[PDB]
Amino acid sequence: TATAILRRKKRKRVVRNNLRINNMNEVGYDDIGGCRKQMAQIREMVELPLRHPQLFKAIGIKPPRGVLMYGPPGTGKTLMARAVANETGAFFFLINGPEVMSKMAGESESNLRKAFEEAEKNAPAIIFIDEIDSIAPKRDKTNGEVERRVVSQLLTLMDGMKARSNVVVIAATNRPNSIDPALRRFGRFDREVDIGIPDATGRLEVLRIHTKNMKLADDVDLEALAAETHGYVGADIASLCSEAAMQQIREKMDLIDLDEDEIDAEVLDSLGVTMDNFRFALGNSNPSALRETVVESVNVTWDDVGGLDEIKEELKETVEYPVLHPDQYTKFGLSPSKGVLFYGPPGTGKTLLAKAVATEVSANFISVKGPELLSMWYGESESNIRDIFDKARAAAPTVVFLDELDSIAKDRVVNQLLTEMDGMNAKKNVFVIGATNRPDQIDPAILRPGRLDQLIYVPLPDENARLSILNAQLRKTPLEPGLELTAIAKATQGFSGADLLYIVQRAAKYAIKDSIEAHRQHPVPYITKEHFAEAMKTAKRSVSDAELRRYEAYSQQMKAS
Amino acid sequence: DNMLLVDDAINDDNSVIAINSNTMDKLELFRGDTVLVKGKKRKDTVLIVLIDDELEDGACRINRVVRNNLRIRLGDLVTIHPCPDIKYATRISVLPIADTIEGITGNLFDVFLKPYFVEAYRPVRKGDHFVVRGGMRQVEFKVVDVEPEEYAVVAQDTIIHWEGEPINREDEENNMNEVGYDDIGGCRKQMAQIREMVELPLRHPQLFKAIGIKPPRGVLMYGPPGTGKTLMARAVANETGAFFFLINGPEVMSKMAGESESNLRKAFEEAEKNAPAIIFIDEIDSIAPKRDKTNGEVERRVVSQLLTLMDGMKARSNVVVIAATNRPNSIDPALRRFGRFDREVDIGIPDATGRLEVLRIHTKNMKLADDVDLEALAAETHGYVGADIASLCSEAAMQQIREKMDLIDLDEDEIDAEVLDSLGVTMDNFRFALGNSNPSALRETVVESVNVTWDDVGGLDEIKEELKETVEYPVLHPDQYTKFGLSPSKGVLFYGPPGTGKTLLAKAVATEVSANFISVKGPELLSMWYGESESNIRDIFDKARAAAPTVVFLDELDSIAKDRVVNQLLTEMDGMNAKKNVFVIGATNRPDQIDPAILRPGRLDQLIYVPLPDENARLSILNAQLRKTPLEPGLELTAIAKATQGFSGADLLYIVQRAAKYAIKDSIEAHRQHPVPYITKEHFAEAMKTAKRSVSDAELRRYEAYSQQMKASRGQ
Amino acid sequence: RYGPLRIKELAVDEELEKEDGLIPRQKSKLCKHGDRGMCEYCSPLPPWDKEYHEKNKIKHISFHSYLKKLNENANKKENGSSYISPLSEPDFRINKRCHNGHEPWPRGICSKCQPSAITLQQQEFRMVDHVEFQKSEIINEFIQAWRYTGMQRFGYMYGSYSKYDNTPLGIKAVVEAIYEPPQ
Numbered sequence A: 001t002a003t004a005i006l007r008r009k010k011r012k013r014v015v016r017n018n019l020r021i022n023n024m025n026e027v028g029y030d031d032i033g034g035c036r037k038q039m040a041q042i043r044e045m046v047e048l049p050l051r052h053p054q055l056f057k058a059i060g061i062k063p064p065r066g067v068l069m070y071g072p073p074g075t076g077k078t079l080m081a082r083a084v085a086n087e088t089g090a091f092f093f094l095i096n097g098p099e100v101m102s103k104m105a106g107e108s109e110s111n112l113r114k115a116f117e118e119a120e121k122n123a124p125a126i127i128f129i130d131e132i133d134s135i136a137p138k139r140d141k142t143n144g145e146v147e148r149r150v151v152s153q154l155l156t157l158m159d160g161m162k163a164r165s166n167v168v169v170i171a172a173t174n175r176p177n178s179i180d181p182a183l184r185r186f187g188r189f190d191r192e193v194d195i196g197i198p199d200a201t202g203r204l205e206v207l208r209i210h211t212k213n214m215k216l217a218d219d220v221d222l223e224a225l226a227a228e229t230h231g232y233v234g235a236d237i238a239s240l241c242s243e244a245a246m247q248q249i250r251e252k253m254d255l256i257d258l259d260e261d262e263i264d265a266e267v268l269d270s271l272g273v274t275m276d277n278f279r280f281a282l283g284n285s286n287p288s289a290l291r292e293t294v295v296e297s298v299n300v301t302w303d304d305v306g307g308l309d310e311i312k313e314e315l316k317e318t319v320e321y322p323v324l325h326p327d328q329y330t331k332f333g334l335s336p337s338k339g340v341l342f343y344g345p346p347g348t349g350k351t352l353l354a355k356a357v358a359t360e361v362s363a364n365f366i367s368v369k370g371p372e373l374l375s376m377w378y379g380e381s382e383s384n385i386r387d388i389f390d391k392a393r394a395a396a397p398t399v400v401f402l403d404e405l406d407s408i409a410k411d412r413v414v415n416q417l418l419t420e421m422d423g424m425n426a427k428k429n430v431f432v433i434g435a436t437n438r439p440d441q442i443d444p445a446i447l448r449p450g451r452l453d454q455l456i457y458v459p460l461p462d463e464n465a466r467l468s469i470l471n472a473q474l475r476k477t478p479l480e481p482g483l484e485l486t487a488i489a490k491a492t493q494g495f496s497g498a499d500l501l502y503i504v505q506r507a508a509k510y511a512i513k514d515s516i517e518a519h520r521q522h523p524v525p526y527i528t529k530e531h532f533a534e535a536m537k538t539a540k541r542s543v544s545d546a547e548l549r550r551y552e553a554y555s556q557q558m559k560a561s
Numbered sequence B: 001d002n003m004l005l006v007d008d009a010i011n012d013d014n015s016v017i018a019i020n021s022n023t024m025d026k027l028e029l030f031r032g033d034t035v036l037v038k039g040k041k042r043k044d045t046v047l048i049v050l051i052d053d054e055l056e057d058g059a060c061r062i063n064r065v066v067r068n069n070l071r072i073r074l075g076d077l078v079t080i081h082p083c084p085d086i087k088y089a090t091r092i093s094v095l096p097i098a099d100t101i102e103g104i105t106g107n108l109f110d111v112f113l114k115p116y117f118v119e120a121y122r123p124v125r126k127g128d129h130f131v132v133r134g135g136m137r138q139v140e141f142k143v144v145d146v147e148p149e150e151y152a153v154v155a156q157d158t159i160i161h162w163e164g165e166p167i168n169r170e171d172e173e174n175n176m177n178e179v180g181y182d183d184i185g186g187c188r189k190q191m192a193q194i195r196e197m198v199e200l201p202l203r204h205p206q207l208f209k210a211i212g213i214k215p216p217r218g219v220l221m222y223g224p225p226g227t228g229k230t231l232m233a234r235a236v237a238n239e240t241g242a243f244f245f246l247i248n249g250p251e252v253m254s255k256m257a258g259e260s261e262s263n264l265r266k267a268f269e270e271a272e273k274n275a276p277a278i279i280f281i282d283e284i285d286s287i288a289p290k291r292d293k294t295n296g297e298v299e300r301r302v303v304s305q306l307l308t309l310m311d312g313m314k315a316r317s318n319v320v321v322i323a324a325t326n327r328p329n330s331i332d333p334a335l336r337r338f339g340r341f342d343r344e345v346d347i348g349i350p351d352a353t354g355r356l357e358v359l360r361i362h363t364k365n366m367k368l369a370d371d372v373d374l375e376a377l378a379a380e381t382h383g384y385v386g387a388d389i390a391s392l393c394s395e396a397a398m399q400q401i402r403e404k405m406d407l408i409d410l411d412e413d414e415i416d417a418e419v420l421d422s423l424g425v426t427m428d429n430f431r432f433a434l435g436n437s438n439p440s441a442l443r444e445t446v447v448e449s450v451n452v453t454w455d456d457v458g459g460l461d462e463i464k465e466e467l468k469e470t471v472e473y474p475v476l477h478p479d480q481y482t483k484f485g486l487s488p489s490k491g492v493l494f495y496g497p498p499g500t501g502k503t504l505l506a507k508a509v510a511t512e513v514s515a516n517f518i519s520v521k522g523p524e525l526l527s528m529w530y531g532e533s534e535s536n537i538r539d540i541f542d543k544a545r546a547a548a549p550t551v552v553f554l555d556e557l558d559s560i561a562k563d564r565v566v567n568q569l570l571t572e573m574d575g576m577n578a579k580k581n582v583f584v585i586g587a588t589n590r591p592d593q594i595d596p597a598i599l600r601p602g603r604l605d606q607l608i609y610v611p612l613p614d615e616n617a618r619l620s621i622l623n624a625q626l627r628k629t630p631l632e633p634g635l636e637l638t639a640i641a642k643a644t645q646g647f648s649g650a651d652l653l654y655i656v657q658r659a660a661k662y663a664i665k666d667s668i669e670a671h672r673q674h675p676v677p678y679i680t681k682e683h684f685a686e687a688m689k690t691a692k693r694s695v696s697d698a699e700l701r702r703y704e705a706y707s708q709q710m711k712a713s714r715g716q
Numbered sequence C: 001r002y003g004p005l006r007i008k009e010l011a012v013d014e015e016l017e018k019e020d021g022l023i024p025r026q027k028s029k030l031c032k033h034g035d036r037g038m039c040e041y042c043s044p045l046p047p048w049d050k051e052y053h054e055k056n057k058i059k060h061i062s063f064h065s066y067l068k069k070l071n072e073n074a075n076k077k078e079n080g081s082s083y084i085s086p087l088s089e090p091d092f093r094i095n096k097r098c099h100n101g102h103e104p105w106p107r108g109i110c111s112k113c114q115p116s117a118i119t120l121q122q123q124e125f126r127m128v129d130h131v132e133f134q135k136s137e138i139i140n141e142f143i144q145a146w147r148y149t150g151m152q153r154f155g156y157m158y159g160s161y162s163k164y165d166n167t168p169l170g171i172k173a174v175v176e177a178i179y180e181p182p183q
């Protein structure tokens, strides 16, 4: 069950080199890391149909064929496909999207015909239709005759392929909805796999895989780099390493005479990548995966947040029990609730609560910020709500955090969201968590049963919660020995978490200012109480009293009702 | 050692070099030795070594022709190496220069070359020049072809083929390729970037093998049209010595259907087959425009073929692809990911020094008159790209020709050489050309550099220190921020009455950290809102990233911040990496009208008030605006500054401008009547008589009330 | 090689290459311009003009003229490229070694080394234009062979090539003798 196929080179000093223990293909499972679940799914759906076809005969079923991988560009879909194909060691026919699309008119279809015919002839075969979108975009995108001839030919070949032949088709596309919808029916690319950005452990694995040949200096802390790099896809990490090496060589260029074709061997052998080079590369790099909705994991437990004990218990009862113990729910025959809606003053930490809920069920987390909602409302966002929920289904269990519903729920977008939520499978674990500061403005239609009906109030932090938050925010900062914070926490009655963050940030700013002054004068390794007092002299609440009274009145109305 | 000094040789032989005895001993050379000499631009030649003690130790003498061939000037350094493996030229094909051979009758070969090569054994290499002085004539030639290649010794038995059509001289000059770095000025930063990104992968590939990394391949340059992108690419290619394979966009897109793909495939195949190579895809936007543009199949097949070729070259081949586009968003987005044009370079309008360098580069063949003040022209030319400066020089020359046209007979087709000598451009001609100039770079947002210090902004010391601690410290001491684990602040929002000089503060902040400055005025934002502009916010921030450390400036943001545009701006601000040294500075007069979303933390949160100038500040502003004006000796502006309480900087500028207008009026009237080199205090009094405040009391009170509210909001 | 290839070929090719073959045309009655200055109908006719060939009952275009057409179609001077060979003999055999990650054809193939569909089409340029028999005896004896024996024959025909004025940049193969192999 689960990742059961992963447990236990490339079918292959001189002996070690021969046994593999510019064109160095045949990258095995070793050359991939941080995507264990998806790799396990692909292996399970590819190997067994080909390596061991007699099991299906013994049990008497027709194995699924179409496999559709999709995820943000650069996550390594092509790498995974090539690795699986080489590991299986079967006739591997490779077809690219643009490569076929670049042919003359009338020749981009005969190539597909011959490809499928040859794959059938030499079974078992694996066909990797890379960038399938280019040859089968959305129906409205292309109206030309050729752009429909190609799609029709692809569909006919796919339908004709479904037979005893041990041939499996794999396709890759960044946008799940970009593919022609007709390609996602039974007997076609039905099984779908979602690739999400890696987590800290995945980033560490990727960095180790790429950083095995570079002449790394001893003062390298790859763990720190993995911790700092957030939202970096594998391609971004490779670019980071390349940029760091480029920076190292640039720094060493002083002793390098460019005029001479050759260089002194000692200088060439003295190259060494330092941590500062990696930091500079991080400064230069610029990830772009987060620009669009992606699937990622979170590791927030019930300790980075303060208070809200009743809220924590309510969320546990709502989400954990259906996930951990569905058997008792079936015993009582009651289906679990679908969504939840957090409301309260801003800055109380609703995002952290959503992340903690996702972590407890060990479910992937998808987010939709306010600007994303506005972009979708204006109809200039590449993705779509249907796309979001399709990815959520493919990556179940999942938690979809819709932030700032008030912007759109002041509607086409609201109607689409309602339809998607209603159409959700009852037993499938697709939780929806909404965040809003103005519950009244929200369209009441969303609050009907079977929807975001479970409203939860998030109160402002209490003295204990304020102290806990302040301690958590200052944990990773050099503080003066015996530096108390209870007095500050008590003095910050009515302060939201953002206010405490602002206070600590200003204190650190004063500390760094003093340190810079001292260094220029020549000292300040800590953040002493004077900086905190100076910052506090200017800090103040960010929530007006009337807002708090309105929230309290709404909570009282809900309780009474 | 072998870095011999260049000097003019007494002899007129084209393959003889005289060297010092001491250097000859150092290099173990001897008389009559044929040696390979390398100068500049990778130029090489073969010279017969002759001992000569007259030269100082470490110096060599070569004649004019050899220096011209080597593209080097007297006083430079040349490297001389042994050439013992030079074979005799089996067959040399040589043709003359047409202009030189004009007026020659009979067989040129017997007249000039036959005595020149017999009993001479002159080494000859392709692309060299040799001049024969026969009788009363002197004729230059070219080493068109040599067998064996590429060079060999012309022996007595060597066969010489002089047959062939004359070679026009205009080709060598007017086709002046092989342009070195000395032909590019004002863009040293981008030139250095391209050099460090191209030369090292090609010139020293073993470096990356030693470090065991895959060097970046794609490169994408972009900037305003006419900024010398093609010139920079050509210069880099020529200096690197790689197999340059220039490809044009319009040229490829003008072929019949089914031919552009073949041309691209053939080009890439040839580039691969002759590694190392440098492919330059000019005007790539004309090959792969944005998706929303032409949807025709002929417009998609070319893009798909280009993508396939780009993806297919990942191998041990030394191929570098350079593309040029006017804007980054024109190219299809698919061409901006890993394994493709992932490295970007931005070209911006030059500063004063850049314009001076451009003028000197172009104004070296002009017969300029003595009264030339290139520095003055550079100061008075703002926003000119290189092409505009070249056009300015051409127009000035045309104006000079027009002025001298009086002494020319148009009907006669011959002009006296004396008149031609008198030709010379003058400063008035350049001023007229400027008057006829039509700059167009500024019509869109463009990266630029500013040079304002903490002296053009009077007073406001607390604001200056706040900006310093907000911006300068992160850039210069990021290690401290890392030590304390504090993320630097992104941007600030300046608010206050108009005319306080917010733009000056932004420029000063940009200058202090030595950061490029990008400006986005209100009309540009409105044009983006209506969608009739050539650029979008995403493009602006992409250019800001490319030209980091940059400072983006928005003016009168309240016009759009009263929304699709604001949503795009928020998305871009959230997207940018925090570590990137990009600061977004907004300026507005009605802060409360700004959308609250803009003021949230992680965005333009910091809010800074810009008060009106005070008495000392007003005096400093007046003095600064009058530094380059002739004033009345003994005149004091303290009284004027005192009397101008409550006036803005724009008001003081208006007062000074009116005073200057009155001064010029009086001077012109006096000259017509015919004195007043400066401005007397009476003019200043007259100008002040018309003074009018640009700020009403109610608005100032409202600004003060808002400031008090903000202070109370942070006072507990 | 930074330009056109360097090799020595038949003299006919050289002499033909030296010529340009332009067919001059005089002032058409439809022109609107002074004596000097040619607009669109008075311009010289390129040697590859298909209209002239099909108008004069010539079915093909004298290969050298086709080479001139190809050279004119591209390869701008002084810039725009570093020379691309305009003529390439098509090859259909599958590349035995492509290796984007796949193995040779016998047990693996990609879409980059797959022979694309072949579009057969009548060629438009004929290399050799006119085959010329020096004397009637040369072939009369050959046919006399069949007359006497009654069986078919087969023999190579040696000869040499030369210009052919009757066609734009045309070539003629003059056959001198016939040799009959043992068959």
Ligand SMILES: Nc1ncnc2c1ncn2[C@@H]1O[C@H](COP(=O)(O)OP(=O)(O)OP(=O)(O)O)[C@@H](O)[C@H]1O
Residues within 6 Å of the ligand: A031, A032, A033, A034, A072, A073, A074, A075, A076, A077, A078, A079, A080, A130, A131, A172, A206, A209, A233, A234, A235, A238, B338
């Ligand atoms: N485990 C990994 N996950 C992600 N990237 C990886 C991993 N290991 C290596 N990489 C690097 O990440 C990049 C992935 O390239 P790849 O071509 O597979 O990406 P892609 O976006 O899936 O491709 P495609 O163009 O086919 O859509 C390469 O640099 C590869 O070296």
Ligand SMILES: Nc1ncnc2c1ncn2[C@@H]1O[C@H](COP(=O)(O)OP(=O)(O)O)[C@@H](O)[C@H]1O
Residues within 6 Å of the ligand: A304, A305, A306, A307, A346, A347, A348, A349, A350, A351, A352, A461, A465, A469, A496, A497, A498, A501
């Ligand atoms: N228990 C808590 N209460 C309030 N704020 C917290 C708490 N824990 C962490 N935070 C801080 O709250 C910030 C995010 O607030 P959150 O409410 O999740 O988003 P928003 O402010 O948009 O509603 C983080 O920067 C975090 O440091």
Ligand SMILES: Nc1ncnc2c1ncn2[C@@H]1O[C@H](COP(=O)(O)OP(=O)(O)O)[C@@H](O)[C@H]1O
Residues within 6 Å of the ligand: B183, B184, B185, B186, B187, B225, B226, B227, B228, B229, B230, B231, B232, B282, B324, B358, B361, B385, B386, B387, B390
């Ligand atoms: N240093 C320079 N920077 C910019 N332009 C320059 C410079 N030196 C010369 N120029 C002139 O500016 C023009 C640059 O043309 P360019 O913009 O590169 O052409 P393209 O439109 O192909 O990009 C040319 O006329 C060139 O002679």
Ligand SMILES: Nc1ncnc2c1ncn2[C@@H]1O[C@H](COP(=O)(O)OP(=O)(O)O)[C@@H](O)[C@H]1O
Residues within 6 Å of the ligand: B456, B457, B458, B497, B498, B499, B500, B501, B502, B503, B504, B613, B617, B621, B648, B649, B650, B653
């Ligand atoms: N220290 C200063 N304070 C205010 N204005 C100044 C100062 N120094 C110069 N100025 C003038 O103020 C003008 C500002 O113009 P403008 O941009 O329209 O207003 P603002 O800069 O306030 O937005 C400039 O033309 C400049 O000459």
Ligand SMILES: [Zn+2]
Residues within 6 Å of the ligand: C027, C028, C031, C032, C033, C037, C038, C039, C040, C041, C042
């Ligand atoms: Zn005419």
Ligand SMILES: [Zn+2]
Residues within 6 Å of the ligand: C098, C099, C100, C102, C109, C110, C111, C112, C113, C114
């Ligand atoms: Zn192949």
